[PDB]
Structures are given as structure tokens and as C-alpha cells.
Amino acid sequence: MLSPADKTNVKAAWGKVGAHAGEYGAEALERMFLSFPTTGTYFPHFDLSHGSAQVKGHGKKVADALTNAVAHVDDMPNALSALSDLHAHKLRVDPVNFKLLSHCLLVTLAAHLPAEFTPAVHASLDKFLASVSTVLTSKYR
Amino acid sequence: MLSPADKTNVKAAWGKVGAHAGEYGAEALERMFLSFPTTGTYFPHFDLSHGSAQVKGHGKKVADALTNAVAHVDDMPNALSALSDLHAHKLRVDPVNFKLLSHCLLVTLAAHLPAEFTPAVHASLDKFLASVSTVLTSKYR
Amino acid sequence: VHLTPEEKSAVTALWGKVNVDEVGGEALGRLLVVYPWTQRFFESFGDLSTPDAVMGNPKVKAHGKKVLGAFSDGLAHLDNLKGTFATLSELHCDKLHVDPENFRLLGNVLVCVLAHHFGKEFTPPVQAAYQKVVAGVANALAHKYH
Amino acid sequence: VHLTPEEKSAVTALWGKVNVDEVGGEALGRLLVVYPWTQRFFESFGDLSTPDAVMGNPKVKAHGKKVLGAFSDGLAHLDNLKGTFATLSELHCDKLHVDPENFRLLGNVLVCVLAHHFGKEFTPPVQAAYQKVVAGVANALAHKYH
Ligand code: HEM
Ligand code: HEM
Ligand code: HEM
Ligand code: HEM
Numbered sequence: 293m294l295s296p297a298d299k300t301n302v303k304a305a306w307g308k309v310g311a312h313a314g315e316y317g318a319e320a321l322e323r324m325f326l327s328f329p330t331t332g333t334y335f336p337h338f339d340l341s342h343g344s345a346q347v348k349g350h351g352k353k354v355a356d357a358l359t360n361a362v363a364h365v366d367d368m369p370n371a372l373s374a375l376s377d378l379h380a381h382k383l384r385v386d387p388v389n390f391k392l393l394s395h396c397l398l399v400t401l402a403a404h405l406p407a408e409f410t411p412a413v414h415a416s417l418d419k420f421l422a423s424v425s426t427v428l429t430s431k432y433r
Numbered sequence: 434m435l436s437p438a439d440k441t442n443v444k445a446a447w448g449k450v451g452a453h454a455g456e457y458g459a460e461a462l463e464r465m466f467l468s469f470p471t472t473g474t475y476f477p478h479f480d481l482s483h484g485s486a487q488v489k490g491h492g493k494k495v496a497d498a499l500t501n502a503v504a505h506v507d508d509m510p511n512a513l514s515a516l517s518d519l520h521a522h523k524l525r526v527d528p529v530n531f532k533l534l535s536h537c538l539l540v541t542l543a544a545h546l547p548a549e550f551t552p553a554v555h556a557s558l559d560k561f562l563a564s565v566s567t568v569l570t571s572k573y574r
Numbered sequence: 575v576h577l578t579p580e581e582k583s584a585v586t587a588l589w590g591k592v593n594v595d596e597v598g599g600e601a602l603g604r605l606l607v608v609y610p611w612t613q614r615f616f617e618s619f620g621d622l623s624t625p626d627a628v629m630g631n632p633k634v635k636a637h638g639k640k641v642l643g644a645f646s647d648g649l650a651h652l653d654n655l656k657g658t659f660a661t662l663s664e665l666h667c668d669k670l671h672v673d674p675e676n677f678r679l680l681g682n683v684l685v686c687v688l689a690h691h692f693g694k695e696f697t698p699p700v701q702a703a704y705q706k707v708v709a710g711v712a713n714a715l716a717h718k719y720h
Numbered sequence: 721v722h723l724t725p726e727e728k729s730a731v732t733a734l735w736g737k738v739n740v741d742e743v744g745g746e747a748l749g750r751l752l753v754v755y756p757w758t759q760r761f762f763e764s765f766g767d768l769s770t771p772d773a774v775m776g777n778p779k780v781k782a783h784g785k786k787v788l789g790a791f792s793d794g795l796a797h798l799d800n801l802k803g804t805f806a807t808l809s810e811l812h813c814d815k816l817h818v819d820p821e822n823f824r825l826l827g828n829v830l831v832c833v834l835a836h837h838f839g840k841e842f843t844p845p846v847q848a849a850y851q852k853v854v855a856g857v858a859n860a861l862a863h864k865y866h
Contacts, residue, residue: 383614418754543686
């Protein structure tokens with residue numbers, strides 16, 4: 293449950309991301325694949341090599357969805373219904389993995405938004421990614 | 434989210450627990466302490482000896498709370514608010530421990546309800562314990 | 575693993591009483607029913623639409639028997655699980671692409687199945703020994719992932 | 721842990737650029753802020769009511785340096801984190817009653833602080849090696865729990 297401060301914190305931080313979200317999407321994945329190699333089991337059809345167009349393209353897709361979620365911070369469940377469906381009924385990624393991508397996205401933002409990555413913003417973003425995670429895994433069973 | 438099916442399943446299995454809830458709660462704790470010793474760090478003030486009155490006493494308390502969530506299966510967030518607050522604000526039990534107690538509660542029920550512990554009931558009961566856990570951890574941050 | 579001798583005996587005594595054929599089918603079916611997401615690997619198994627469809631599917635029962643078969647072997651080399659499971663670990667990773675979290679879910683399901691079957695005989699301390707065992711196998715199975 | 725010579729060098733060399741004082745006070749404060757429940761062990765520290773209050777608390781800052789200190793000394797025994805943290809492992813269990821999960825949370829916080837600090841320098845491959853170390857340390861600290 294995101295507080296008003298949190299929603300603010302999140303909108304500010306993502307606000308700074310701007311035209312780079314896609315690149316940050318890609319970089320988070322790359323960090324995820326190297327750090328938690330088990331996450332690769334969901335992408336056997338991809339080339340996980342550095343700067344792979346597949347990873348790149350996928351980073352964009354993840355970024356855009358995050359953007360959309362920040363924009364509908366108030367109506368997440370609804371803004372991401374289709375994605376919750378896709379993941380629950382088609383992809384079927386085990387829920388433990390959502391914590392792994394979340395962490396990699398923090399790391400990525402930390403490394404690129406030094407001034408903006410304060411302890412309070414760090415707390416908000418974590419809660420945010422947790423909420424996004426919850427929504428995407430809400431129809432699993 | 435619990436379906437009508439789930440609710441019937443839960444009321445039915447818990448129905449059978451009846452008057453044994455206390456003893457089953459105590460037993461779930463003991464199994465938890467023996468299998469996942471790190472959970473003991475929250476009970477430094479307890480005698481965790483076999484048949485400790487404290488554990489016995491604590492088992493009733495937990496069982497009473499679960500019985501209470503079954504009784505209010507359509508308003509759990511409210512029926513458990515108090516307990517949600519206690520856990521978030523005073524006890525501050527790390528979230529991963531909930532999944533550990535859940536698991537041991539499932540083990541105990543299985544060991545005592547061979548006839549009712551069907552695949553379908555097992556699934557409903559798991560979803561139920563996950564929901565109770567989600568409630569008790571909702572106010573953590 | 576860290577199994578006291580008295581833990582290794584209790585594991586072994588009980589295991590003597592298990593019908594690997596039956597327990598195998600039960601554990602695998604219960605997994606597909608409690609954590610439906612795990613069905614992702616078995617779309618060629620057919621109808622897994624309801625609990626009855628899963629539990630009674632001849633392919634699920636057969637597979638379960640295979641899995642528990644391999645697990646029973648693991649119980650005789652409790653000293654070298656990583657060794658024992660090496661080729662299987664490589665296969666689950668490189669060919670099957672099975673996320674190792676699946677192995678921990680299956681372990682927990684197996685413990686419930688053993689509790690279901692043995693009732694009171696599955697004492698707090700026997701479960702503690704089996705918890706150590708299922709964790710070691712899941713670890714062994716994941717050891718070759720890269 | 722199971723660090724490659726290359727991975728060993730990357731850890732070793734970034735560390736050398738670390739101001740333990742600052743990184744340690746920041747890791748511990750962020751921990752208290754991001755995961756508020758960790759504050760259950762620091763009641764005696766004072767006012768942890770706000771991010772500002774945590775980050776400023778010198779008791780926090782000083783505890784942070786003591787923790788990173790010990791951690792720092794552990795990177796010198798990357799081949800025996802277990803024997804290096806054995807007494808610290810018994811202490812956390814038996815005297816402090818600290819749930820090992822906290823070790824994992826800090827590790828993760830630690831990695832976000834390093835990225836925060838080194839931006840560019842903290843590349844994916846360098847993060848991977850640190851991830852292996854934080855896991856390794858957490859594992860070692862949890863080792864003597866019973
Ligand atoms: C932060 C939470 C996540 C978000 C917002 C997210 C979002 C997305 C989006 C937008 C897509 C593309 C949908 C389309 O093609 O229209 C997607 C697909 C996919 N996601 Fe998720 N995802 C998340 C977490 C995960 C995790 C943790 C994994 C696995 C570890 C994962 C695995 C996949 C896979 C395998 C695909 C399909 C890739 C392909 O075949 O092109 N997702 N996700
Ligand atoms: C869904 C599972 C849980 C339920 C229903 C539950 C319920 C309760 C209840 C009813 C009490 C007593 C409060 C009172 O005095 O009125 C309690 C206290 C407590 N619980 Fe929880 N709890 C759960 C999970 C956990 C877990 C997983 C842990 C740690 C492993 C934990 C640690 C404690 C502690 C340390 C106390 C205080 C005991 C005492 O000093 O008397 N709880 N819980
Ligand atoms: C105790 C843990 C497990 C053991 C010992 C085990 C063992 C085995 C064995 C012996 C095989 C056949 C190998 C071959 O085809 O050459 C197999 C195949 C397979 N296993 Fe595992 N397994 C385990 C857990 C799992 C779990 C939990 C899953 C998925 C949730 C899984 C997914 C599969 C799949 C998809 C196949 C191939 C089936 C086919 O199409 O023929 N396994 N396993
Ligand atoms: C990197 C992992 C950690 C290391 C290396 C570590 C190390 C230390 C050291 C060297 C001490 C000094 C106490 C003494 O020698 O008497 C200490 C104390 C303590 N640690 Fe840990 N620690 C770690 C993680 C944690 C975490 C995550 C927590 C809780 C969130 C924690 C809670 C405490 C507490 C409560 C004390 C006692 C301080 C006092 O006496 O006021 N530690 N730790």
C-alpha cells in the first residue's frame with residue numbers, strides 16, 4: 293500500500309528516467325541474467341549475450357509497462373490486467389523471480405540517478421516494485 | 434483471492450479440526466522449531482522443550498486466530514486488523530517466516546486429516562494460509 | 575547435508591515403507607494442482623484442467639514414478655548427492671530449462687504427502703530429517719545450473 | 721566463495737576504493753529505512769522515526785562501520801568465510817537472536833549502496849561477483865544457528 297509520499301517519490305524518480313527507461317530496462321535484465329542465472333530458464337529462445345537485440349527490445353517492453361504503472365499508480369490492478377493474465381496463464385514465471393528483477397531494477401536506478409536515489413526514494417521504489425509484483429502474480433491461482 | 438470453492442474447502446477441513454485446533458497449533462509450532470531453527474530467534478523468552486506449556490499456550494493462541502479468520506472468511510482484513518498491527522509494530526517478524534509456519538500448519542493437518550486432505554483441499558488450505566499471511570504482513574511498511 | 579546418524583536411520587526406516595510408485599504420482603499430481611504454474615512443463619501430458627484430471631492422468635502418474643525413482647536412488651548416496659544428481663542437473667538446466675525453485679516446491683509437497691500417508695509416524699523430528707533431505711536434493715539438482 | 725580469479729580481482733579492487741565509514745553507515749541506515757522491521761534490534765539507538773532521523777543517528781552510523789569493518793576483514797578470507805565468521809555466527813544466534821534473513825537484506829542493501837556510489841564502475845559483471853560475496857557472507861553468518 294503506497295502512501296501519497298511514495299507515489300510522489302516514485303513519479304519524481306521515474307520522471308528523471310525519461311528517454312532512458314528502455315536502456316535501464318535492458319541493463320536491469322542484463323544484471324539479472326548474470327547475477328541470478330536461474331532466471332535465464334524463462335528465456336531459452338533469446339540470445340542472452342551482451343547487447344543482444346532481444347534483451348534490448350525486451351528491456352523496452354518492461355520499461356514501458358513500468359511507466360504505464362507509474363502513470364496509473366492509483367489503478368495498477370486495472371492498468372496491468374492484461375499483463376497479470378499473460379504471466380498467470382501463459383508465461384507462468386515462478387513468483388520468486390519477481391523479487392530478483394525488482395532488486396536489479398533498484399541497482400540500475402541507483403547507479404544512474406545518484407542524486408535522486410535517497411533512502412526515502414529507495415524505500416518508495418522498493419514498495420512500488422513489490423506492488424507491481426503482487427499485481428502481476430495475483431491471478432496465479 | 435479465495436473462490437467459493439476454496440471457502441467451502443476451508444470451512445469443511447477446519448470444521449473437522451474442531452476441538453483439536455489447539456493441539457494442532459502447538460504441533461505446527463514444534464515442527465517449525467525442529468525443521469526451521471532460525472524461527473526460534475523470535476522466542477528467546479520461551480522454553481522450546483518438548484511439551485513446553487508456553488508452546489502449548491502459544492499454539493492455542495495461533496489456532497484461535499486461525500479459527501477466527503475462518504469464521505470471517507469474507508472480511509479477514511478486518512477480523513485480523515489487530516493482529517496485523519501487533520505483528521507490524523511490535524513483533525516485527527520478518528515476512529519469510531510466515532511461509533514457514535504455513536508449511537508446518539499444512540503438514541500437521543495432513544498428518545491428522547487423511548480423509549479430508551485431498552488435493553483440492555490441500556490447494557484451498559495453502560491459498561488460505563497465504564491470505565492470512567498477507568493480511569498479517571500488510572502493515573509492515 | 576548435515577544428517578546426524580540417528581537422522582539418517584529415521585529417514586531410511588520410513589523410506590522402507592513407501593510405495594515409490596504411488597507416492598510419486600501423488601507428489602507430482604499435487605504439485606500441478608497446488609502450484610498450477612508448474613504445469614508449464616507438461617503441456618504434452620494432456621488434460622490437467624481439474625484436480626481429477628491431473629491426479630488420474632496416466633502420464634502424470636508415470637512421470638511421478640520416474641522422478642521418485644531417481645529420488646530413491648539419491649537416498650542411497652546421501653553422502654554424494656551432487657555427484658549422484660549431476661547429469662540430471664545438467665539435463666534440467668540445459669535441455670528442460672526447469673527453474674530450480676520447482677525442486678523446492680516439489681520437496682515441500684513430498685513432505686505433505688509423507689505426512690498424509692504416515693500420520694502420527696511422521697513425528698516432528700522425522701520431518702526435520704526429511705526437510706534436510708529434500709533441501710539437499712533440490713540443491714544437488716540445481717548445482718549444475720549456469 | 722566460488723569466485724573466479726577474475727571475479728576475485730574485481731571484488732578486491734573495487735573494495736580498495738571504498739570508504740568503509742560512509743558505506744557502512746549508509747548500508748545500515750538504508751536497511752532500517754527500507755525494511756523498517758529491522759529496527760527491532762536497535763531500540764536503544766534512539767530516534768529512527770524518520771529517514772532523516774535514521775541516517776543522522778550516530779549510533780547507527782557507528783554500528784554500520786563496525787559491521788562493514790567485520791565484513792571488510794572477511795574479504796581477506798574469501799576461501800573460508802565459514803571459519804572466519806564462526807564466532808560472529810554463534811554470537812548472532814545465541815546472544816543477539818538475529819534472524820539470518822536480515823543478513824540477506826543487508827547484503828542486498830549493500831549492493832544498492834555500492835551501485836549508488838560507483839555508478840559506471842559497478843558493471844553487471846562486477847555486481848555478479850559482489851552478489852556471490854554477499855550471499856557467501858550471509859551463509860557463513862547463519863552457519864552456526866541451531
Ligand atoms: C517487474 C515485473 C515485470 C514486468 C512489468 C514484466 C513485463 C513484461 C512485458 C511488458 C512483457 C512483454 C509482453 C508482450 O510481449 O506484449 C513480458 C514478457 C515476458 N516476461 Fe514479464 N515482466 C516482469 C517480470 C518478469 C520476470 C521476473 C520474468 C522471468 C524471470 C519475466 C518473464 C517474461 C518472459 C519470459 C516474457 C516473454 C518474453 C518473450 O518471449 O518475448 N517477466 N513481461
Ligand atoms: C499466520 C500465522 C500467524 C498467526 C495466526 C499468528 C498469531 C499470533 C497470535 C494470535 C499471537 C498472540 C498475541 C496476543 O498475545 O494476543 C501471536 C504472537 C506472537 N507471534 Fe504470531 N502469528 C503468526 C505468525 C507468526 C510467525 C511466523 C512468527 C515467527 C516465526 C510469529 C511470532 C510471534 C511472537 C514472537 C509472538 C509473541 C509471543 C509471546 O511472547 O507470547 N508469529 N501470533
Ligand atoms: C526430486 C526432484 C526431481 C527428480 C529427481 C527428477 C528426475 C527426473 C528424471 C529421472 C527425468 C527423466 C530424464 C530423461 O528424460 O532422460 C525427469 C524428466 C523431467 N523432469 Fe524432472 N525430476 C525432478 C523434479 C522435477 C520438477 C519439480 C519438475 C517440474 C516442475 C521436473 C520437470 C521435468 C520434465 C519437464 C521432464 C521431462 C519429461 C518428458 O517430457 O519426458 N522435474 N526428471
Ligand atoms: C554483514 C553482516 C553482519 C556482520 C559482519 C555483523 C557483524 C557484527 C559485529 C562485528 C558486531 C559487534 C558486536 C560484538 O562483537 O559484541 C555486531 C553486533 C550486532 N549486530 Fe551484527 N553484523 C551483520 C549483520 C547484522 C544485521 C543485518 C543485523 C540486524 C539488522 C545485526 C544486528 C546486530 C546487533 C543488534 C548487534 C549488537 C550491537 C550492540 O551490542 O549494540 N547484525 N554485528
